[PDB]
Amino acid sequence: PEPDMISVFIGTWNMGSVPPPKNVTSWFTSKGLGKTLDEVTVTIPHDIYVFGTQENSVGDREWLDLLRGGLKELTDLDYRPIAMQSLWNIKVAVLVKPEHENRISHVSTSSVKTGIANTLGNKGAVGVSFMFNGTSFGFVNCHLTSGNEKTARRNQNYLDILRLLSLGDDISDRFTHLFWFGDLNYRLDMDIQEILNYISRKEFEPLLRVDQLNLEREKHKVFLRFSEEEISFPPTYRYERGSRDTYATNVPSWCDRILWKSYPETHIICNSYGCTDDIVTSDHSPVFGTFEVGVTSAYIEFESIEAIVKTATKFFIEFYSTCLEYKKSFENDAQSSDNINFLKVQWSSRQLPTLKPILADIEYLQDQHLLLTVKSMDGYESYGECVVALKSMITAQQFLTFLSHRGEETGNIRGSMKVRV
Numbered sequence: 001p002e003p004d005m006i007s008v009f010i011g012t013w014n015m016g017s018v019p020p021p022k023n024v025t026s027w028f029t030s031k032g033l034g035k036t037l038d039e040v041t042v043t044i045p046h047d048i049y050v051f052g053t054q055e056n057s058v059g060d061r062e063w064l065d066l067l068r069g070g071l072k073e074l075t076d077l078d079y080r081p082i083a084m085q086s087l088w089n090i091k092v093a094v095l096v097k098p099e100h101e102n103r104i105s106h107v108s109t110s111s112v113k114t115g116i117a118n119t120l121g122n123k124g125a126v127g128v129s130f131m132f133n134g135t136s137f138g139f140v141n142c143h144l145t146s147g148n149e150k151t152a153r154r155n156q157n158y159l160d161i162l163r164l165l166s167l168g169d170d171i172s173d174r175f176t177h178l179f180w181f182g183d184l185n186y187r188l189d190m191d192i193q194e195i196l197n198y199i200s201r202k203e204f205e206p207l208l209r210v211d212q213l214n215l216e217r218e219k220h221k222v223f224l225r226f227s228e229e230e231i232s233f234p235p236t237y238r239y240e241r242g243s244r245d246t247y248a249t250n251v252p253s254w255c256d257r258i259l260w261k262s263y264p265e266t267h268i269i270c271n272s273y274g275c276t277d278d279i280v281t282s283d284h285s286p287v288f289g290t291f292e293v294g295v296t297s298a299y300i301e302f303e304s305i306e307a308i309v310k311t312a313t314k315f316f317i318e319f320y321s322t323c324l325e326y327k328k329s330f331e332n333d334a335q336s337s338d339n340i341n342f343l344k345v346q347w348s349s350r351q352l353p354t355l356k357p358i359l360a361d362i363e364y365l366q367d368q369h370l371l372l373t374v375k376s377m378d379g380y381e382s383y384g385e386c387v388v389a390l391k392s393m394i395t396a397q398q399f400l401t402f403l404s405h406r407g408e409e410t411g412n413i414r415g416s417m418k419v420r421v
Contacts (some may be wrong), residue, residue: 002297006047010289012181014054016282026276027286034233034274045075049095052141054183056091083128087111088121092141106131112164114157129167134296138175142182148249155222162407170406181258186213192251226259229273236275236285244277258289265389267294296367298421300355303396305347305415314377323368327353366391384410394419
């Protein structure tokens with residue numbers, strides 16, 4: 001009866017403060033350049049459409065009506081808005097096929113301004129989250145600091161959004177699938193003429209080697225734990241308005257991006273990632289991404305858990321899951337330190353709780369996830385969280401993962417657990 005997979009469309013477009021054209025068909029249908037949807041059979045009406053825009057001067061009401069009208073003319077379906085959020089001229093909207101409206105719950109929205117001198121809200125982010133049956137989704141649409149030289153400012157904008165957006169403890173591990181897209185504004189570290197030469201040859205690999213987002217991700221400095229699909233479309237900025245023949249330091253760049261972060265052992269596949277070449281009202285080309293995503297419609301026991309945490313003495317663990325009705329441990333009963341500012345802490349089975357899932361079916365349990373948070377006895381401060389999938393843990397089996405807190409890696413965790421049915 002209920003679906004076990006959905007198709008999600010994500011579109012991002014910096015509209016350049018001018019009216020869009022009446023027809024943006026190519027954007028909605030993943031047609032143009034890059035990884036595209038070419039066949040009739042794969043160009044499907046998606047279950048969820050998410051539209052993120054920047055420099056959007058269309059009124060909220062009017063823009064949503066254009067999206068609803070556009071989807072209706074395209075699909076013959078009356079797509080239902082489930083949420084929308086604007087921050088000044090940064091706007092996101094989520095629309096769902098009518099047959100799925102009953103499956104949506106726990107809708108949330110949020111926005112954050114980023115700036116030192118500027119808090120107008122033309123730089124920042126907007127966010128929307130919800131549950132589709134038992135699977136949660138977060139969508140963040142941003143517009144970060146511009147300029148070739150401002151990489152460090154963009155990385156800080158990212159960190160500030162991650163820490164301050166109140167969707168649904170940062171947002172990193174709040175959702176089964178977190179999509180982050182927009183005008184990220186990362187540029188190419190290369191001279192204008194060399195860039196244009198490579199673009200003429202349709203040779204994108206030499207350019208992608210000097211893309212600042214790729215370099216910063218590779219250096220572990222931003223978008224930790226996010227993935228991006230391979231880019232095979234030309235830079236989406238900066239074009240002359242009225243054609244895509246001519247690019248206008250502001251060298252050509254892939255400013256407009258879609259990235260995702262998913263819970264372990266989930267099903268997610270990127271089916272398209274590209275840009276249009278026939279929408280020409282803005283100095284940016286619209287970018288599309290489509291995804292196939294899995295959705296979901298007994299005693300959990302721990303033999304032991306060991307963690308290494310950054311600290312300069314006693315810690316406990318909180319266990320959280322949507323499949324539970326929340327639970328906690330006693331303090332660690334052992335600790336040691338090979339190195340200064342790191343503490344190895346151990347919890348024997350006596351210190352650890354037994355968790356009780358709501359249903360006992362294997363098909364239900366294999367799709368669930370546990371959130372573990374390590375907190376200090378003194379102050380109840382989080383020193384790190386991680387997510388463990390139950391899919392491979394159903395004898396005792398070992399999990400091994402890493403602790404994160406507010407965008408910093410803060411240690412690791414290893415444990416033995418049993419899921420009995």
